[PDB]
Design a protein around this ligand. Sequence first.
Ligand SMILES: Nc1ncnc2c1ncn2[C@@H]1O[C@H](CO[P@@](=O)(S)OP(=O)(O)OP(=O)(O)O)[C@@H](O)[C@H]1O
Ligand SMILES: Nc1ncnc2c1ncn2[C@@H]1O[C@H](CO[P@@](=O)(S)OP(=O)(O)OP(=O)(O)O)[C@@H](O)[C@H]1O
Lengths: 414, 414
Amino acid sequence: MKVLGVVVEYNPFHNGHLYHLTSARELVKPDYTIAVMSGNFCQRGEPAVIDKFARAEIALRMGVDVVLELPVVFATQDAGGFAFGAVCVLDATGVVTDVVFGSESNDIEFLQRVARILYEQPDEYQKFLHEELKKGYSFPNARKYALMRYFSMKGWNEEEVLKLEKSNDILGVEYIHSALKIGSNIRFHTIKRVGARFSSATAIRNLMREKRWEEVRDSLPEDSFEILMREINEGRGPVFLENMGDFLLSFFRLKNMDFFEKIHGFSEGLEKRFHVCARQTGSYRDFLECVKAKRFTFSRIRRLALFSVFEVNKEFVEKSNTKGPQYIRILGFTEKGREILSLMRKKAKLPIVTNMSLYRKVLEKTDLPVDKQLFLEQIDLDVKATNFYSMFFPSVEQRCGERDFSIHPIFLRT
Amino acid sequence: MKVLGVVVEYNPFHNGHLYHLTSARELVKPDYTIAVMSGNFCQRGEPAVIDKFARAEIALRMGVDVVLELPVVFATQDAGGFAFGAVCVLDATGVVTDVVFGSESNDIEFLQRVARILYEQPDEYQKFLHEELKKGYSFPNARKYALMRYFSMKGWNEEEVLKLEKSNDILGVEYIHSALKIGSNIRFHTIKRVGGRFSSATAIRNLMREKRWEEVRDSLPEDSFEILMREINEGRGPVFLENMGDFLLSFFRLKNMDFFEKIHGFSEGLEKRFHVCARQTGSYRDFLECVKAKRFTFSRIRRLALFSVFEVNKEFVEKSNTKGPQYIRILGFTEKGREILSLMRKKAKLPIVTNMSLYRKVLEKTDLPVDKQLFLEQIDLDVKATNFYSMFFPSVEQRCGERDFSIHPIFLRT
Ligand SMILES: Nc1ncnc2c1ncn2[C@@H]1O[C@H](CO[P@@](=O)(S)OP(=O)(O)OP(=O)(O)O)[C@@H](O)[C@H]1O
Ligand SMILES: Nc1ncnc2c1ncn2[C@@H]1O[C@H](CO[P@@](=O)(S)OP(=O)(O)OP(=O)(O)O)[C@@H](O)[C@H]1O
């Protein structure tokens, strides 16, 4: 039988997301659909505008059967790490046969060809890559130029490689590359991205900031808007990066360069830039602009700020990017979802965590040969991120307790 | 020639402080007056309501000739550590002859008698203490009972040991004790504490919170009130603990018990209490009440919160409480003050820091047998505290830069 996996953030779940999910299901005709979803922080280094429990419920309402958390250590990395974590979780379920992602080109054959080269690492490609890195280009640029030069040597059209300047197709190549690395049999598919009625998740979050609520409503499915309003009515949203800005900036003034040198992703003089800009600027917005230069994107800097505040160190990320996620966290499922979750319990290659109050017992008793210390470090980060995030709920009445322990997986009858 | 030393916090400088300074000057008739003053955080675990540069200027205008900073590692400790740092700084100037402190008993002979016992550690006293250290008693209590039982054996009145339940006389004993430890020749004196026109510093900060400025005005010398208004009008005040509360509470959610176990001052299950209360409560006020129990003072809990965010570890404090402050930091001086500073350059036992941009050069060039690593760690903490505190200036425009480097010692002309 067929099971559709999808890799998602849903920050917030909007019409474009409904378009993807519906397209994916109609294309593949799966018996079940499983989503692996970023938690309370997304890949761009921002908080989710409402939390993962709310967004899990929306995913269920929109046609997902089971929602899994993509652990924080992957959810907040650049595309390579993000993709690797996401494919490991989907593959580890033991049931996912097909994955569909939105694509600018909608050219799956092109993406598979590129993923194969990056997987096999032919020496001519490596030679080109090394030269470009030596020339001082950043890895994404160097890889691009190296692939182009490789395409040319092969008598292919190198201009086709320009498709990899588009974010979603880059991610696509990384999903496929990850599946190749871990030996997964998952079939990958593209669907065409449309619009940016379809506003980007970032535009919609900006509409919320400006309190243009009618336009927000026009951008989201009804159940998504309803849950968004629910969270806002109870003071659990919206949550914006700028709400965390004074914390981040103040926290960096507590740290010296020695600290940042241990944090994953620091290189190219970024330790000194974090150290100096933290002391010379008075707001996180100004901080970001101070650290920012030609060779750094805002998303890279914002990711580094999250890695710093959560003390996500180099050794921990190295192990996570080698051994992968050590557990499957269930954020929610439907009555129909029970059926595929039951099969996962038989077929999964990682321990399944439903009841967080039990996760240490799950680890102690599992037959699966996981890395115990890595498991504990990974899930501790997931919990820490939730606990930190909840301090920024607008209403103080919502800031108590550990929501990973107090909120069980969302459940909806079918 | 006589130089009056005074140990002070001045948070803010009020009429009781003017009474003390006037009384001390009348008693000692000093040629010069040097204050050693807590920086931007005081001994009760709270931020100074305006910063150290403003309060140093107030001190000079009220008749102090030279203001020195009490380094943070001492300023934020309990009475023993606070006193030790303060007396070390004053003794290290090489010019201080007399120290006068406010006293509940105004009985200097008694305070001297108690410090002598603590310093000389009689056999009988040590026995009692070891007994009392068992039966679960914390040291300051076990000490009090050991002292009482000691007083009985010698045939003195043990009820008199209850004079040491009083805050100022506790400090008095510790100043004298510290002077004996380091072999200081400083003469200590008491003046009786008096108390309308006299409100405590805590009462005045609450008046400020409630915006009763006329009552604040009535509690403060004119120049003290004037500079308080200046800082407020210029967006550098007031600064209250509750302004830092969300930072502290959020920060504790980033930490596990292993972290608090390394922080100075943690014992008696306080690590578990910090950890659990941080996750169970939604505000720092609620956090503090959660941690509070009969055997804990709020001041101790508040101090521990400060040691936690500044990562003031057990070993760093143990060395500091052994070797003392490694530098004399000058916050301000008058014209008259320049004179005694000139003599200090010949007589001082620690390196003197005027220009913070030069402190590494000072440390490099000094012939004094300081601990260089400890010097660097102590002054790093002073700078960190200033930088952290400045993020809580009400005006965002005032939050940039490192004030320790941007603001030279205050110089007042006569
Ligand atoms: N307009 C659109 N058309 C088709 N597919 C889309 C889409 N928008 C998203 N998807 C697909 O929906 C899936 C989940 O999207 P995430 O939650 S990972 O958000 P994101 O893609 O970064 O959204 P953004 O910020 O608005 O660009 C992915 O396969 C998308 O390609
Ligand atoms: N009313 C008073 N009478 C006599 N001396 C006093 C005094 N108030 C302060 N002093 C003396 O002034 C000196 C500086 O006091 P800090 O700056 S250390 O403040 P603090 O004493 O904690 O003030 P509080 O919080 O208002 O009780 C000390 O020797 C005091 O004894």
